[PDB]
Design an enzyme around this catalytic site. Structure first.
Site, mmCIF file in Angstrom:
data_model
loop_
_atom_site.group_PDB
_atom_site.id
_atom_site.type_symbol
_atom_site.label_atom_id
_atom_site.label_comp_id
_atom_site.label_asym_id
_atom_site.label_seq_id
_atom_site.Cartn_x
_atom_site.Cartn_y
_atom_site.Cartn_z
ATOM 1 N N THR B 16 8.170 2.474 8.568
ATOM 2 C CA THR B 16 7.403 1.290 8.198
ATOM 3 C C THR B 16 6.340 1.617 7.159
ATOM 4 O O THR B 16 5.345 2.271 7.474
ATOM 5 C CB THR B 16 6.710 0.656 9.422
ATOM 6 O OG1 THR B 16 7.681 0.366 10.434
ATOM 7 C CG2 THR B 16 5.988 -0.627 9.026
ATOM 8 N N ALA B 17 6.554 1.167 5.922
ATOM 9 C CA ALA B 17 5.679 1.572 4.835
ATOM 10 C C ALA B 17 4.266 1.056 5.102
ATOM 11 O O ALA B 17 4.045 0.183 5.946
ATOM 12 C CB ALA B 17 6.208 1.054 3.499
ATOM 13 N N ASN B 18 3.300 1.586 4.362
ATOM 14 C CA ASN B 18 1.954 1.042 4.413
ATOM 15 C C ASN B 18 1.563 0.388 3.094
ATOM 16 O O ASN B 18 2.036 0.766 2.019
ATOM 17 C CB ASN B 18 0.944 2.135 4.779
ATOM 18 C CG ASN B 18 1.259 2.795 6.110
ATOM 19 O OD1 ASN B 18 1.083 2.194 7.171
ATOM 20 N ND2 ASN B 18 1.734 4.034 6.061
ATOM 21 N N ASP B 123 15.439 -11.928 4.784
ATOM 22 C CA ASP B 123 14.552 -12.399 5.862
ATOM 23 C C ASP B 123 13.221 -12.992 5.366
ATOM 24 O O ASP B 123 12.173 -12.345 5.409
ATOM 25 C CB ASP B 123 14.345 -11.252 6.882
ATOM 26 C CG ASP B 123 13.479 -10.126 6.351
ATOM 27 O OD1 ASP B 123 13.448 -9.867 5.147
ATOM 28 O OD2 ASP B 123 12.772 -9.450 7.246
#
Ligand code: ANW
Ligand code: ANW
EC number: 2.7.11.1
Lengths: 599, 599
Positions: B16-18, B123
């Site tokens: 999960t990137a930041n 999405d």
């Protein structure tokens, strides 16, 4: 952190004694902590008893734990003081009219209560005057801390003396500036200030030194930048002048009466449609419409008889003795329009042309923060003016639409009256000849003049109707093509820029308290300094090039359109009075046709 | 902190990137930093080119210094995302109507642009949809990050599939709740959710499980708590139902047309004075008044012929083919009133009776923060309803005042007509006897019936005027004695309590992120928990005991007053039609008096 039995407070949350923000140990409730033998416990007891809406409540006096010093647990005011408020950029040129009236009310009620109890508050000032949010969302102001710029002429050398700082405070609250201003600052030039205060000619309310060692500008009026309505300005100005030699000061009892007379007055919003000016009429509940017209004349120069009223699309006919409390409710958005059958100069909104100060490239936490306040205050003023200019245009457009509807009613009332007398004229003209078949030539010749006289009215009425129609020369379309509209969203565009400017102002206020910044925080501070000027230049360009220019075109177009409107009412009246004159001459020859008969 | 050649950013300012909030080293400008061979550089290049109002701009791709990882410097959005917005308490039951339309516009324009360029955003969801403040103060929404609750029925097992999450998003934005809700949460009951999505009968737009293992409540309509006008609700509802088996899904081209047809419509504000209901009419610029009446009938059940219009104090007569873009400008505060000569049930505002949830004494950072959101959302709803109820009362009071003014015009139009025919009746009745002095008995007997017939109208007109006068039985005074008024300031009282509640909600959101509190901060958290319930109980008491109770008394009084109004118009019409009938019979015997003469 220190503490007492019931309270504790961090020293960082500090609000020359100190005031901290703390909590009750058992509830968590916020309170003001004042951190510094029986000479004080006595005056503290009488103060502990004071329960009033306009006095910050003192709950208890406890002893801190580490020191035996007496502390006071006082009512906490989350918003701060009038100084805080007056430091905000949207109040840089005075409080909103609605807000100014709340300050006056609460200060006045607290003072009298103090006098009624014998206390004297030697130095009232915006920093002494705390603000709290009432349970109904309206500010409530409360006095606390009893026992230079505000000091009396006798006190500056080192009761009425209290009225002086009250006077300065109200002027500051009303205008955003101090009334007595040496060049630079009063503290900086303490000596110039004393000459100003003692040598002030009676009646004057301000003195400003615009250049160094320069003259004093006296004024008996409020500055143009004041936001208070002229109606309010007209009542406040004499009070300040006459309460700022205490021999000729007004005195409290007179002051309380004169101020109560203001507070008890209601406000009626009036818009002069021919002058393009909005007005607030400060009038007592029990005053009559007769009195109302005089107050309007004072602001408009329209004599009572010439005041023609329009409200919600229809004429408003006021009876001279009808009390003001029974008048229709009005707002700035929904005012009573006044019009006149006599030519009037179109004035419009009169405001000050104020340019931006120059932005000093020299990094200075104090100067930039000082500059940020001033330049942000100007944009706030520009935004408020933009809104009033737009409102003036929106009110103009609505009022004109209603007046056109009013004239059509008048046009239809007289046009019916004519056709109503035609049915008798065209009937009685022949009934005369009816008898003839069963001097009369002199009756027919005089009568045929009436139909011929009535034809010149018919063609003239058709010409006024033609002008009131969509293609008519008194058409409405122009009002939607000139000036600015809500859909243009000019006000939101300015407020957005102001919000960007306001964030930097608050940051400069924070940057000031910390005496020095690190290298990184320093660069960021300099970057936003150029953005400030960039936002202000863009905003002013948009304000001057778009809002003002288009406003003057709509206004200039109105002035000629107004001139036309006056010409039509004058032509209609002439056609209307002739219809009554014709009506009675036909109602006179109707009977002289039939003579007495033998029987 | 990390950095690149042109940018740097603290790790604390993480968005999960930041994603962090950083600055350009040379300017200081805010940018979004996305922190995680040539397969990506290619799609990055096409994305670097994308310049669109509804796409967050990607400026540059640089290499961080400590890692060689690729970072993207993206446009920073100070406000956050639609999720953030939908988490705020005043949007807990849907966005404001004006705001909902902006989301629709910007999402639609970005999607089509994406399709036009071949990108697919698998999405879409409120967390993907970022908000920025436009230069005119209106929100602008921009899509970013392309490449469970929103997943398609086929995707949940693990293009139109994109339309599904679009559908859920719009329902969530419109109502504040997800359309498909198992008991507890969808994630908690992943299995129940899939049955709901596949087994949904066509046309249904929601399914809510109110008890554990309980049934599904289907609906084809929006919930009552939705703030969108019925006018808008009527157009949006069929779109969602028909885009949520992709065989029978609407498809994009149809979707783009149907949504454009909504966005291109203008809004006309209508208030049904007899029903006490406000309405927004969603109508195309080029539609006629004929079409307008049909849309109003759909919401009111008033047939076109029965729709009687009042605007700014005067009748509004619409010509059937007059286009809507030429209609007068309206707002919620200044709507077009519709009235009818046919009896109608007084409906008023229909709203949900919603009580407070119970406050769980058990200290729980997650539960209290979760509870704080729900209970604060209810008070926001109560405040919005209080405002609409007050508005309904203010609009009622204004419209009635205008209608009374309209009736007086009607009363004066017919009353003049009568006196206008009296001048001929009283004239021709004697002129008959004039010849007599120079069968006629049958003419006088029929004529004396007209004066006697005209006396019954006169006394009946005097009776209607008497009722329209200040003491009349159709008096206005009651409207100022019942219900609530702006001067009562009930709305401000509720917003003040809401602001206290909102501060605690934001603090609970902060208290949650920090997993544990120290003893002192813990106690303060528990103290404000009881104040929350205390503020809510006080507010609800004030809302129910004061606002609602008085609203129903004003409404109940209106219903009888309405009944009276209908009786007067019916009596006036009868007197009015007789004046035309009488007028023509007198205009018929006027000539049969004179015979042909020998000559
Ligand atoms: C930081 C500054 C804007 C500020 C903010 C909140 C404040 O809240 C107060 N409450 C009080 N009862 C008293 C008092 O009773 O003296 C004084 C203050 C402040 O000075 C005060 C000052
Ligand atoms: C703390 C939370 C309410 C918050 C506040 C501001 C934010 O500002 C953003 N800007 C962006 N360009 C992007 C993006 O382009 O993904 C994402 C965010 C946030 O997540 C974001 C999240």
């Amino acid at each position: 952190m220190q503490s007492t039995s019931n309270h504790l407070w961090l020293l960082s949350d500090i609000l020359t004694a100190n005031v901290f923000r703390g909590r009750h140990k058992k509830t968590g409730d916020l309170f003001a902590i004042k951190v510094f033998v029986d000479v004080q416990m006595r005056e503290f007891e009488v103060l502990k008893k004071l329960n009033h809406k306009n006095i910050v409540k003192l709950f208890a006096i406890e002893e801190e734990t580490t020191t035996r010093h007496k502390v006071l647990i006082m009512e906490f005011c989350p918003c701060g003081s009038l100084y805080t408020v007056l430091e905000e950029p949207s109040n840089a040129y005075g409080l909103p009219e609605s807000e100014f009236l709340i300050v006056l009310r609460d200060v006045v009620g607290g003072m009298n209560h103090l006098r009624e109890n014998g206390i004297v508050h030697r130095d009232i000032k915006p920093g002494n005057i705390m603000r709290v949010i009432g349970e109904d969302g309206q500010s409530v102001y409360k006095l606390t801390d009893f026992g230079e710029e505000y000091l009396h002429p006798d006190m500056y050398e080192r009761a009425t003396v209290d009225l002086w700082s009250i006077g300065v405070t109200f002027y500051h609250a009303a205008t955003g500036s101090l009334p007595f201003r040496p060049f630079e600052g009063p503290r900086r030039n303490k000596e110039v200030m004393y000459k100003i205060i003692t040598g002030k000619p009676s009646g004057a309310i301000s003195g400003v030194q615009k250049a160094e060692n320069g003259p004093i500008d006296w004024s008996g009026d409020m500055p143009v930048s004041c936001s208070l309505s002229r109606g309010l300005q007209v009542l406040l100005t004499p009070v300040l002048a006459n309460i700022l030699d205490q021999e000729k000061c007004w005195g409290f009892d007179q002051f309380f009466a004169e101020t109560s007379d203001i507070l008890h007055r209601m406000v009626i919003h009036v818009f002069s449609l021919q002058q393009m000016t909005a007005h607030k009429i400060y009038i007592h509940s029990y005053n009559t419409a007769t009195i109302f017209h005089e107050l309007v004349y004072k602001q408009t120069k329209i004599i009572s008889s010439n005041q023609e009223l329009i409200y919600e699309g229809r004429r408003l006919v006021l009876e001279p003795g009808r009390l003001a409390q029974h008048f229709p409710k009005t707002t700035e958005e929904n005012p009573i329009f006044v019009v006149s059958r006599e030519p009037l100069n179109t004035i419009g909104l009169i405001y000050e042309k104020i340019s931006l100060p120059k932005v000093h490239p020299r990094y200075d936490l104090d100067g930039d923060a000082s500059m940020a306040k001033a330049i942000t205050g100007v944009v706030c003023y520009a935004c408020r003016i933009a809104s009033t200019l737009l409102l003036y245009q929106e009110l103009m457009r609505k009022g004109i639409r209603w007046l056109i509807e009013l004239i059509k009613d008048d046009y239809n009332e007289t046009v019916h009256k004519k056709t109503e007398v035609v049915i008798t004229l065209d009937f009685c003209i022949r009934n005369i000849e009816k008898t003839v078949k069963v001097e009369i030539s002199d009756i027919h010749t005089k009568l045929l003049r009436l139909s011929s006289s009535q034809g010149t009215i018919e063609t003239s009425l058709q010409d006024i109707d033609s002008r009131l129609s969509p293609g008519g020369s008194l058409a409405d379309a122009w009002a939607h093509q000139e000036g600015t509209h809500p859909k243009d969203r000019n006000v939101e565009k300015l407020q957005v820029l102001l919000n960007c400017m306001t964030e930097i102002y608050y940051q400069f206020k924070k940057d000031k308290a910390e005496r020095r910044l690190a290298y990184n925080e320093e660069q960021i501070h300099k970057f936003d300094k150029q953005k400030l000027y960039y936002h202000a230049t863009k905003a002013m360009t948009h304000f001057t090039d778009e809002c003002v220019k288009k406003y003057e075109a709509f206004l200039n177009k109105s002035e000629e359109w107004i001139r036309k409107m006056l010409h039509l009412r004058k032509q209609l009246l002439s056609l209307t009075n002739q219809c009554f004159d014709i009506e009675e001459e036909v109602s006179k020859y109707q009977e002289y046709t039939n003579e007495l008969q033998e029987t």
